[PDB]
Symmetry: C2
Subunit: 193 residues, 2 copies
């Protein structure tokens, strides 16, 4: 590559020499000439390499930025406690809310895909309908089961969770929600009369 | 900055001159000297700037890589149709599955946070329990409601969805799942006898 500072400087010192042969003067100037063209070329090649690298880093910051989305609107424990007075810090911890911040995009995508397929609600509507699912699950189901339960006790308690586990066994062997035969149905009709 | 190739070359041409004054020879060599130290300095400064940029791009590829996670295990429409014979392309489209691939990390995090708070299942357990939620919602609830419904008809049809909308109204004004008074409860006891 280009000459080190000390090699260049030696040439300049040679050239100062008053008794340098003419051929020697020309040669040394030629070495300076050749060298400088090479230094300039190395330099320009560095200049394009630095700029290509600046291009790539800029796209990688935008690309990164878009898939991260707006940091500002992340829901925190603090936000949750604030906007949902029924939820404690203890519940947040038990539910492992903060661990969702460790998940990568592929994992979250897959998770959400599975929720959408399970609950039968289009993705763009899902957040809006999350309260409706909380209500089905934590209230109506429990009150609906209770009513059947209270009546089943005065006719004889149903083993509702035996039913549930059977329907999960069925789904896992089939991989079809379609054609689960939920035994709850049968026993409810035996209670119908 | 450093001299252009053509400016450098002029100096070399001056130096060739046989009748150049001694003072003139020294001066021109000094210009060459000063210039080369500057070129070398500019160069080294570019060399560290290129490398700092290479550092930053490398971290930005790892940082990006970790939050994207493994591209290979993304669930596709093709995967879904394959592993769930009960689900069609039409259902995938209606559910807008593919649109989940457009969501950023903040959005997916927030969505999952809301599911976990709504269904009361810790995050690390959520995927594993998604089939159980599908069963509660698509089977037991419907069979449980049916039983109450069939009995309510032969005693007089309950307006179950009037109940649901009221509990959602209550939740939206309160922001507490806690203290929803679901009217379903009341009417079920009026059917109890």
């Amino acid at each position: 590559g280009p000459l080190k500072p000390e090699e260049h400087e030696d040439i300049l010192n040679k050239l100062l020499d008053p008794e340098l042969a003419q051929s020697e003067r020309t040669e040394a100037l030629q070495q300076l000439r050749v060298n400088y063209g090479s230094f300039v070329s190395e330099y320009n090649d560095l200049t394009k390499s630095h700029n290509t690298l600046s291009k790539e880093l800029d796209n990688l910051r935008s690309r990164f930025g878009n898939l991260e989305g707006n940091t500002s609107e992340r829901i925190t424990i603090k936000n949750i406690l604030q906007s949902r007075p029924d939820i404690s810090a203890e519940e947040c911890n038990f539910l492992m809310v903060e661990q969702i911040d460790s998940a990568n995009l592929t994992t979250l995508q897959n998770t959400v895909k599975e929720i959408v397929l399970a609950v039968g609600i289009p993705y763009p509507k899902l957040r809006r309908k999350i309260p409706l699912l909380a209500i089905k699950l934590k209230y109506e189901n429990i009150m609906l089961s209770n009513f059947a339960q209270r009546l089943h006790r005065q006719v004889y308690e149903m083993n509702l969770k035996k039913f549930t586990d059977q329907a999960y066994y069925d789904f896992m062997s089939t991989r079809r929600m379609d054609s689960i035969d939920h035994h709850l149905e049968r026993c409810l009709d035996h209670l119908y009369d």
